[PDB]
Amino acid sequence: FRNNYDGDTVTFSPTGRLFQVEYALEAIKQGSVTVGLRSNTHAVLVALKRNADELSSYQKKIIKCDEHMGLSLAGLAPDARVLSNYLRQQCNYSSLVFNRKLAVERAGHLLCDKAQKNTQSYGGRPYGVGLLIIGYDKSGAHLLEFQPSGNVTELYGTAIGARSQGAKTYLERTLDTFIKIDGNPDELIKAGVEAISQSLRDESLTVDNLSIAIVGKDTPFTIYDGEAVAKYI
Amino acid sequence: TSIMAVTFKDGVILGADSRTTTGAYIANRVTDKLTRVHDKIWCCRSGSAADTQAIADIVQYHLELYTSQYGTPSTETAASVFKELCYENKDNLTAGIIVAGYDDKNKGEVYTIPLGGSVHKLPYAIAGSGSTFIYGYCDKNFRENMSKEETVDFIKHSLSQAIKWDGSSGGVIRMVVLTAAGVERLIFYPDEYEQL
Amino acid sequence: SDPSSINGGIVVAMTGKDCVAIACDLRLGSQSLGVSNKFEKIFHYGHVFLGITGLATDVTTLNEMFRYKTNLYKLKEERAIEPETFTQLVSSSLYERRFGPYFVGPVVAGINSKSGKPFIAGFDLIGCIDEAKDFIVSGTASDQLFGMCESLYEPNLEPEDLFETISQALLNAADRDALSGWGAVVYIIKKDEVVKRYLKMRQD
Amino acid sequence: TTIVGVKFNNGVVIAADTRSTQGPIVADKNCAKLHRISPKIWCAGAGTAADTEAVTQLIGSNIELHSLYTSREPRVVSALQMLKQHLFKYQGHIGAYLIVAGVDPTGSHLFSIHAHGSTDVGYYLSLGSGSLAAMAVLESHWKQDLTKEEAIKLASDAIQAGIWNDLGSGSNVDVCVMEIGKDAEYLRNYLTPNVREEKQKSYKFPRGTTAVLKESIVNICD
Amino acid sequence: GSRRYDSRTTIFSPEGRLYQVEYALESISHAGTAIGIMASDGIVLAAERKVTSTLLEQDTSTEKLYKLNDKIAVAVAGLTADAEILINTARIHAQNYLKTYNEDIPVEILVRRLSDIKQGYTQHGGLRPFGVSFIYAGYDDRYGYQLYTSNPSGNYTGWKAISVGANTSAAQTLLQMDYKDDMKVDDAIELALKTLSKTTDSSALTYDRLEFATIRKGANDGEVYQKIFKPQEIKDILVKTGIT
Amino acid sequence: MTDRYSFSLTTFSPSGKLGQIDYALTAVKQGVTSLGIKATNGVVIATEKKSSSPLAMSETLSKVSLLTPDIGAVYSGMGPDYRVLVDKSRKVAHTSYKRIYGEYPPTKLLVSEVAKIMQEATQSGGVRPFGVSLLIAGHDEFNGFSLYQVDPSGSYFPWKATAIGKGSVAAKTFLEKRWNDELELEDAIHIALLTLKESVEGEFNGDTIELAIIGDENPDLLGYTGIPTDKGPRFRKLTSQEINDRLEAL
Amino acid sequence: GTGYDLSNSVFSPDGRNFQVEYAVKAVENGTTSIGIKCNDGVVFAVEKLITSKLLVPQKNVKIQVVDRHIGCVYSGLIPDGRHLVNRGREEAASFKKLYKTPIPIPAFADRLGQYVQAHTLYNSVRPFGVSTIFGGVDKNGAHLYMLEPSGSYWGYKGAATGKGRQSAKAELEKLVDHHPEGLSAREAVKQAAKIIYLAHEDNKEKDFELEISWCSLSETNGLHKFVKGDLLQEAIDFAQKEIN
Amino acid sequence: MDIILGIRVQDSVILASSKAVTRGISVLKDSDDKTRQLSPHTLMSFAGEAGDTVQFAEYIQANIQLYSIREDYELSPQAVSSFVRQELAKSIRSRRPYQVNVLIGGYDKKKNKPELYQIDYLGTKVELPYGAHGYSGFYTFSLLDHHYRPDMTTEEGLDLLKLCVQELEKRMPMDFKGVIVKIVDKDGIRQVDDFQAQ
Amino acid sequence: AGYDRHITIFSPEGRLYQVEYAFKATNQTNINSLAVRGKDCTVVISQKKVPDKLLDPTTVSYIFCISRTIGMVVNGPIPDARNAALRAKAEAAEFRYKYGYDMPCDVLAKRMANLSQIYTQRAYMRPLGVILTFVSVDEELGPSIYKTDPAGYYVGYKATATGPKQQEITTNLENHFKKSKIDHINEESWEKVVEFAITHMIDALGTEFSKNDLEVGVATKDKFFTLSAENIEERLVAIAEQD
């Protein structure tokens, strides 16, 4: 079975699966955990940076795409770079040509369409990375989950990566609670850190290990690392 | 060259002179400037003969393929193809085309595509060097919903004048009647229209 | 300015009785300055002869080109090209550069090895074939040559006679042209042999 | 150049003079301006010589190949469509003006084509610097329903108007008749009204007249 | 994708060999034998026509000896069609060289170019190599008489006498046995015919099954002459040497 | 999309064979028999019109094609491959020869052109060799009459007479017996008809046979008159009638 | 042998293209969606599985519009569906640009048709993992279509695909019989909401979200518009009622 | 223009080339060597457009040298000039032609005879006893047409040049700052460092 | 090795399996069709089968109008059939444009056949699993029927049939012609020719037809058109009053 239908993306299995795409998804899981949640005024990204050695850094997992948009990555870093960069251009284009900030919903459509291309043509490989996009546009706070399959979804909150299932259940519970953390950033963040810890196990989120990013009504997407997050550990 | 297309109660009529010149010499005195792009969509050509013939030929091609796939095209669509060619290649074309077609729903329709490549839908349209001389007359004598016989007269008189003053025009006056009845070819010789 | 008048030169060809003659001058100058007195303008590929007047660089380029084409032709065809055929090759080769021509005026002369018939032809710079039975002229002194030929020519001349006629046609025309002369060479061609003589002419 | 085309009750005929010129000098006193596009489709061309020649052969080539592909006789309208689209493409830079005629499975046809790619249809046509002299004649004698012999006369006369009245035309008259049922008949030098009178003297030179400096045999054999 | 049907014709075997070349050579080994012997006054090219019939037109035929230039000719062993492709491009290179330098192309220069083309299909492109081996017989004013040989690999070398095609090992030994530096064209002509005669996979060595050519500098002249023997000429020389 | 078959589909096997060329030949072996005989003043090529249904019109299917007015071809193998080959051949005759020299190509060269086309379908990326063998008969001023056979490998050879297809072996033998360098065109036409009869199971007449010749010029098939040098095509396909007449003298 | 199912353009011994068939599997495994043609327009509706409470309601839209009069809905690999619409969108713009008039539904159908069929011709591309239901109102009526991964498509009175295509089709067939005079835009909108609810049983495990859109010459002026608020609730209830 | 002279005597070829390099109103250099050695026995002098001049020369130099190493052989002067002509002949019909005129003088070791080639930027080649490019030719052709004999020794050749160079200094409007002379014979190429007063 | 069954290369026996399998696909729709020549027209009958009740019957067809004069009926899957139709239309339009006259039926066939022959030799393009029957009343050849297959083969018929039960229809027709001794239906009106066609279609298939079981196309001088449910019904009633 599978072994004969997983040689490349252009092949369908007898049941209708695209194993290469599936194996790509498998790289997301092996990736460190990250979480995103939004109220009606803000949206927050809390990502757990992973380290190789105790002599190595905790590889950055949050990329800014424009003053009003950003995302967190879980999987192959290079692929996130490629994709984030593409998004940065789409945002830029929208501004320069139409003097309009790119709708988060539309950024999602662009990401889906770009990924889909690497799953129908010979030679290419799917993207091996998951993305969580947050942003404040002409219709408020937004949170998007991007899967290499090409499937992009808008949620109130969510998480991806290893043990990501913990945070996701926690948020599926805390829903009614954080969704109302309007006007208060520090609360939405804390609410996020309390979701990300729901997927810990190995250690505890240190200072040079925690990474948070936020955007909203009067907050240009910004990223906090280290001392900046100390007050959240 | 003097050409015109007039919409009336039962459809539409296209008329033209039959003179093509290269300088003061009349290369052809029995020219047929009334070209068929489709069964019930014809056009009047003015300007570069080479250009208008080539343009027409390409349009006829497009409408023939259009028909193969989507049935009979509207007169508006025929106009859009001419327009697309004239506009897009404005720098290398010298064509003034009048497009006239007969629809069963829209009855008669006339579109004029001047030099720029812009499109104009009108009750009737006149074009060609001779047209300048009959702007006054045509404006004063045109009425909507005229009868076939009336319209054939309007065109016949107008063109006879255009031919009278413009040296680039002359020969015979050809016409094409487009109605639900089908297609009718008309011709009028000098001896008749000169003394109108 | 006019490429066909930078270097100067003339070529003429005539048909006789079972023979053909082709002659040219030896001048090669640059405007008024004469430079070479040995620049010949007649070449041959097998038994087919070609004379090229016009821009020197093109005269040379075309010869090299035709040597090239005739060589391959023989390797494939396994026989040397005939006047008629070569003429067609010249024509198409020239028109191939229709919008950036060679500034030459070619003349073909030879006898069909199969039918023994004499053959001469001329073309303009873009290749239009001018096939004449009597004579073909070309060069900066072409008007003079037309004058000489039209008068001094008569059918079926014999090799020794055609020679006298062609040489007098070339010689006297070249002398009414500031850009031609400075030497001259005539080719008398027959089925079995070909003689090449250098004429003695004014050196001014 | 002077070329004409005349339709007659059962076909069409085309004629042309035989003078070729470079500036005011006559280069060829008898060249053939009548070209065969296909066995029964002939073409008469004026304008840039090399152009009418090349364009004529090219389309002739394609017509032949098209004939073999479709297993049908070539149609004049096809030679007409190919010729014009080719000429148009070149914005008039290929100075070829032609009168194309012939008979095919659909009847007898007469057309004219200009270097820019525009085409005309008619019962009688003329092109060339002799165009007007000829057209004057045609506009004076043409009538509907001409017999093959009447057409040949009318055409032959039109080309003459050119020879005599136009400096760009002269020498002989060539004709080609295409009749709906038979083979096309080419009539090279159907008229030769300009034979040069015998020269007042002979200019044959006494051998030895020309001074030679060197001599030698040339190697033709490889 | 298509990667599934790709034979990867340009890869190395674990032993550092090129499969396709090796197999192409294997193909060449069943081709009619061709021999080239270089003497002091000329070169001789003899070849055995693989398969023939009574009805085969030998007059108009040629399948082993091709003229490249006027001073260079080749003997073929392998796919005739493949050979013709290379022959023609070879002929062009000669002409370019001429048109460029107004001098005939030196024999090795032409041989290297052709061999380089072959080497190409060996290292890139994913196409099969040419199933051809050539014996080049030429003359130039720098090395005079020369004999070369090239094969599918794109490798080429020079010889005094050499063979290609079928039974080369046998033919080479026989040649290495009776060749003498001071030889003469007529001698080589005979050596050549004998060699073929002893390696043929046929009953007898008749004229109808041969192609013969010599490149001499005909004393009464001073230039080089290529002669491609006609059926009749072969039949004679065949009897004379004593093979009737 | 995009042809990602940029590699050869025909390669050398360890044995030295080029499989696809071999198989293409096998395909030819199955094809209906066809032959060609060269006389002293003409050549004749003929084959069987194996109608694939009594409802089909055998005429709308010529196995014998004119390439130039003095060259004709016939085949054995996959008809479709032949059809496109004839097209390419007819065209190359112009593009590479008539348009350059103003005259149609001599038989050997045109054959050489066809052979080239076929050779390439043996090495170019992503293609299979042609499944046909051709017999091309023609005449040119400096080479007279000639007959050639072109194989899928791209190889071609000149013949006095030969046959390809189904019963080629048998037919080739029958030819060796009846051929001689003094045969007149009619003698060959006769011999041709005989050899072909052995390879035909059913009806043997002018409607089940296709035969053409390369002989004298037919000024009657020229289409026009007025040019002495133009005498007419040497290639002529025999009519169903002209065949039967010779069948009664069989 | 076997393996006829590993390359996309390959024909199996029985004349099939297994890769296309495998694509269908991916389609059948997807959400259910339908289309109902009425007397002057068409209605589209699709099931939207609520994977979790985190899915912002009403946000993740699925139905798409092409130009201004075409509505498209599909079952299977969503990304592939978007891809096909992007094409259709260009396909439509191109048509309008040249002919001025907005593209006729049938004409549009073949555009998608030809494009999809195209992805079954080469092994360098994968077939589409979606079945699409689309339609609209044009110069002469309303048209409903369904396109298969094979590129095959036909005009329908009612159409459905996805997990519960059978429940749906069953229902649809009833409607066709019990309304030989023609359903109405208002009617179809509710009827659709019901059929989605019924067909949701073959997935009754997860909760879903309804989504409808329509194009009616009278109700929307021939333009494609989504069913929202009141009219949506009214239809949601009409179903919620008959589900019991 | 600049002065470019070439003269073929009995067993050698002599090339005289002006030393001045002027741009505008200033004479920038007075020791310019308007020559390049293509091979041990082939020398090429050149004159023309400011940049094209050297660029072309060096380009041709590189090719000949590459040929020499590839074939381990020296191309005959005839062959080299044929190569150079073809280059110029290609150039003339290119986007921006090389505006350079050259004189190629070499000693053919196979024929044991010196050769002089004149080729202008159009690709016009011709072999001569003596040649020149530019306005110089207007004074030197008749000068040599008078004082020239084929059997002249290299020494007689240098005196013949001096005679030319003197005529040029007398009548030419420009100050070309003298010339540099070089001899090409069976023993290679050498430069006469004493012509500033020989 | 065994890949000689997946791509278009020769099998040791010299066969091209992919082309053979392509032929297999042409029967997938289980429809039969036949064409016959009138005195001055050409008729094509084809079974029309509409299984689903949800289908708009008016959109189900395997008969196409290629040009004002050419009609083509396909035997095989619809997506391939539509692909072939669009190409044929395109090809016919361009021909007229470039050559100045309507592309003849036989030529369009040869052209389409050639295109198919290419999918036979070049690997990356798969053959189309369809058989194309072209019809018209050529301005030079009169009534014409030309058919092409995945092999790239093509020929003209006096009449022909295609589909699963193709053989019974063929022998039926063969016999009728052995009898009539002529190569066509000696009828003046196409109405009677269409009837003849539908008639022999029944005799061979041993089945009765309703106005919605058939699909008819007629080619006449300067026009090829298809019949309506009613036009057919009228034809059915006519043959009803004879049996």
Side-chain angles (χ1 to χ4, degrees), chain E residues 97 99-103 108-109 112 141-142, chain H residues 67 71-73 76 78-79 82-83 86 110:
Chain E
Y97 191 89
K99 191 179 63 60
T100 301
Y101 301 105
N102 269 306
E103 289 188 355
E108 172 185 55
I109 285 178
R112 182 199 305 130
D141 80 332
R142 172 187 178 176
Chain H
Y67 184 104
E71 247 58 55
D72 184 29
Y73 199 71
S76 65
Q78 199 291 151
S82 284
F83 170 77
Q86 187 157 82
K110 168 170 284 63

Side-chain angles (χ1 to χ4, degrees), chain A residues 36-75:
Chain A
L37 68 171
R38 80 179 188 72
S39 64
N40 275 293
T41 64
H42 302 56
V44 179
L45 281 182
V46 192
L48 184 60
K49 308 188 293 180
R50 173 185 293 160
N51 79 308
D53 286 60
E54 245 60 28
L55 290 60
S56 92
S57 58
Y58 289 68
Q59 183 167 291
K60 73 169 199 299
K61 309 221 306 172
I62 307 201
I63 316 287
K64 175 182 177 186
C65 298
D66 206 356
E67 297 301 307
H68 70 121
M69 204 183 282
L71 80 202
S72 58
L73 66 92

Side-chain angles (χ1 to χ4, degrees), chain H residues 88-147:
Chain H
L88 289 172
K90 291 176 179 175
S91 169
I92 213 17
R93 284 163 195 291
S94 71
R95 191 179 65 74
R96 191 178 71 69
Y98 279 115
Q99 286 174 68
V100 183
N101 297 309
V102 302
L103 283 189
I104 293 181
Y107 189 92
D108 191 340
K109 300 284 287 190
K110 168 170 284 63
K111 294 176 175 179
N112 274 287
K113 296 198 173 189
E115 285 172 355
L116 181 62
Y117 293 108
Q118 206 187 79
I119 310 172
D120 63 8
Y121 77 105
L122 300 180
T124 312
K125 192 180 79 169
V126 80
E127 204 246 65
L128 325 157
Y130 41 94
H133 273 304
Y135 291 120
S136 321
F138 280 87
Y139 299 102
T140 64
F141 281 127
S142 51
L143 218 224
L144 304 177
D145 263 6
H146 184 57
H147 308 105

Side-chain angles (χ1 to χ4, degrees), chain A:
Chain A
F1 190 58
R2 193 181 71 171
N3 190 57
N4 280 157
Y5 306 92
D6 66 351
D8 42 51
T9 334
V10 83
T11 304
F12 260 135
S13 78
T15 53
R17 311 165 58 181
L18 297 179
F19 286 104
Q20 271 304 307
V21 183
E22 285 183 35
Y23 295 0
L25 266 38
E26 192 60 24
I28 281 75
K29 274 74 84 62
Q30 177 185 178
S32 184
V33 70
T34 181
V35 188
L37 68 171
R38 80 179 188 72
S39 64
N40 275 293
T41 64
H42 302 56
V44 179
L45 281 182
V46 192
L48 184 60
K49 308 188 293 180
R50 173 185 293 160
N51 79 308
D53 286 60
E54 245 60 28
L55 290 60
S56 92
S57 58
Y58 289 68
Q59 183 167 291
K60 73 169 199 299
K61 309 221 306 172
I62 307 201
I63 316 287
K64 175 182 177 186
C65 298
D66 206 356
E67 297 301 307
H68 70 121
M69 204 183 282
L71 80 202
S72 58
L73 66 92
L76 285 178
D79 289 13
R81 181 169 164 52
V82 170
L83 290 175
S84 70
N85 188 268
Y86 170 63
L87 188 63
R88 282 172 167 180
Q89 306 183 312
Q90 288 310 304
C91 282
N92 207 194
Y93 182 73
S94 190
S95 309
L96 296 167
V97 179
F98 300 86
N99 190 202
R100 167 189 210 175
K101 289 174 186 173
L102 186 66
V104 182
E105 168 170 357
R106 193 131 179 301
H109 300 310
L110 297 184
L111 283 180
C112 157
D113 287 340
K114 201 197 201 317
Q116 188 279 159
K117 294 166 191 164
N118 295 225
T119 79
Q120 195 172 179
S121 306
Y122 176 70
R125 73 173 175 64
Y127 291 81
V129 72
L131 299 167
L132 296 179
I133 305 98
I134 67 164
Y136 200 67
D137 62 26
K138 278 204 172 186
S139 63
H142 294 285
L143 176 61
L144 262 50
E145 199 192 306
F146 164 76
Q147 289 307 314
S149 59
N151 294 290
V152 172
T153 306
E154 192 176 6
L155 314 164
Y156 290 106
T158 192
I160 52 183
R163 310 153 181 173
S164 64
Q165 190 42 283
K168 196 164 186 175
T169 303
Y170 161 82
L171 286 173
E172 194 157 1
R173 218 288 181 176
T174 314
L175 186 52
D176 311 357
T177 305
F178 66 69
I179 185 177
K180 300 173 61 179
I181 314 302
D182 306 320
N184 195 178
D186 297 293
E187 277 305 82
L188 241 185
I189 296 181
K190 280 180 173 63
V193 186
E194 186 172 66
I196 198 173
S197 31
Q198 214 70 189
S199 295
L200 291 171
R201 185 172 168 184
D202 183 62
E203 56 167 299
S204 183
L205 43 184
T206 84
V207 75
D208 38 60
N209 157 48
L210 183 57
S211 190
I212 300 178
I214 184 174
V215 66
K217 209 171 188 173
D218 280 349
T219 314
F221 181 103
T222 32
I223 306 192
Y224 304 119
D225 286 295
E227 344 61 63
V229 296
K231 77 278 291 189
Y232 291 95
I233 306 173

